[PDB]
Symmetry: D2
Subunit: 162 residues, 4 copies
């Protein structure tokens, strides 16, 4: 919980509206599908799928985005015999959470006021693509924020009677 | 307002506790005091001071931090005649807000639960040093966030009866 | 010359192969073309085109990439009466340099050896999309590097006879 | 070799003069010395030291720099029994390379012209602090660059006779 939060505190982050996050899932999934060659026969245990995902993620860009080529190059870091399985399993896992992000519109619609202003909802994620896709695929939680602001004038000294 | 928040969603951002922001002000201010040579005689108008601050900020690093040398080099972009004035005026503006930063402990301490969890307070600022210092010195507002998280299990389909 | 270099030294940068830079031009140009509504009647002087480009660039993401929506939103910062002209002129300017990047394959093919290794050629650009597109569109030069490496063992002390 | 360079093209990078890199080593080392408490008794094997360094690096900021607190917090991720040893071993490894950094002044001083201009030497490292410190401490090589530029006018079509 607070480990996830500290992970976010220790790196450059990015604000996503629910729509923008849904769109990112659509883009990543479509690129990965372009890499599909033959369908898998065997299917990685979740134990081995985790080890392969590690290699895949270490080969992804830490730039803020990834082109199909970047994704396909990262697929190569995956042991060859397991590549097909890894890839179809990755797509299935992403397509399953892809549907789930739509449920954030519920939470994100609840009005909130902070510092006397309506505070909009935004998912909070790593700016780094490798760190971000790792979070979306394997973490149990997704962070988010309610955003507001404090005017500096309201931070000035306003007497001993508060 | 919304203009300020869009500026934040369009770039890599960073989470600051009130303590780490106060510490950042302390670091930037002592570095700038190290660049002080002579005392200013006549000082800049908010018109000319802003023109000079723009040149100063354009010469600052867009990396996440700035060393003394980076700050002193940026000072050189300021017209030589207006430099000592610009510098003393900049230090005074920063020291004034430096005290106001302490007032954020009020707001920050106010309890809040989001998604059934304690939602900690964090100032939200640009990752880029040039962008961050511009906001802290020139803007009338300072953005912040209340942070929380949704577990993916809670985003799964829970049936037709809410 | 060295001003351009210092600008690169003061911010996070990115290495582009000639092919990857060509592909980036193709992506940006196609997105901007999707924003075209009606053809321009008047056409911005280069003086006014520069002022409008400034506004456009200030509204672009400082994240490492931009989606069509990000580009189209930035187009709105452009004075309305001049939007059409700005946009067609921006596309023409990009399409003209797009052809020119192909000439980098000449320079980039010249073999080079640094530290006893073949040193590959890479264009060097801002990680920030707004800073990058500003450079590609309006600077007179494009930076690049020849990359190599020094082994730490070769940096150890090797006697007084060198 | 090429593995190291691909790692560099897949993330935001930063240009360091030999002086600024030497200064970075000085800063990181004095901060780590501030975390020293007791003297280590028994020390880690390169096997166990690397296992501990991994945990240490994962807890470092991916922001471009690290404060003393960031470094000291990262030290806590190291098993408590191996911590004082890990820390003294880390300081010794850094001080050893700190001296080797000075040898880069040889290579760096060697003249070079690229595209008919003096091509300055710069060490090339990750923007992320965690990635940068990992490379400097663990890698057998250090990447560098010779920097230059091509004017767009020189990329225009110059005719069929070369």
């Amino acid at each position: 919980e607070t480990d996830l939060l500290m992970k976010m505190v220790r790196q450059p982050v990015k604000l996503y509206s629910v729509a923008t996050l849904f769109h990112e899932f659509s883009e990543v999934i479509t690129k990965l599908e372009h890499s599909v060659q033959k369908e898998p026969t065997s299917l990685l245990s979740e134990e081995n799928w985790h080890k392969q995902f590690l290699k895949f993620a270490q080969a992804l860009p830490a730039h803020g985005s990834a082109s199909w080529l970047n994704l396909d190059d990262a697929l190569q870091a995956v042991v060859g015999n397991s590549r097909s399985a890894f890839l179809h399993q990755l797509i299935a896992k992403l397509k399953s959470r892809h549907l789930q992000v739509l449920e954030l519109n519920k939470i994100g619609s609840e009005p909130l006021d902070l510092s006397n202003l309506p505070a909009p909802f935004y998912v909070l994620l790593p700016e780094s693509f490798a760190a971000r896709i790792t979070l979306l695929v394997q973490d149990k939680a997704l962070p988010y924020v309610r955003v507001s602001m404090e005017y500096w004038h309201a931070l000035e000294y306003k007497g001993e009677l508060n």
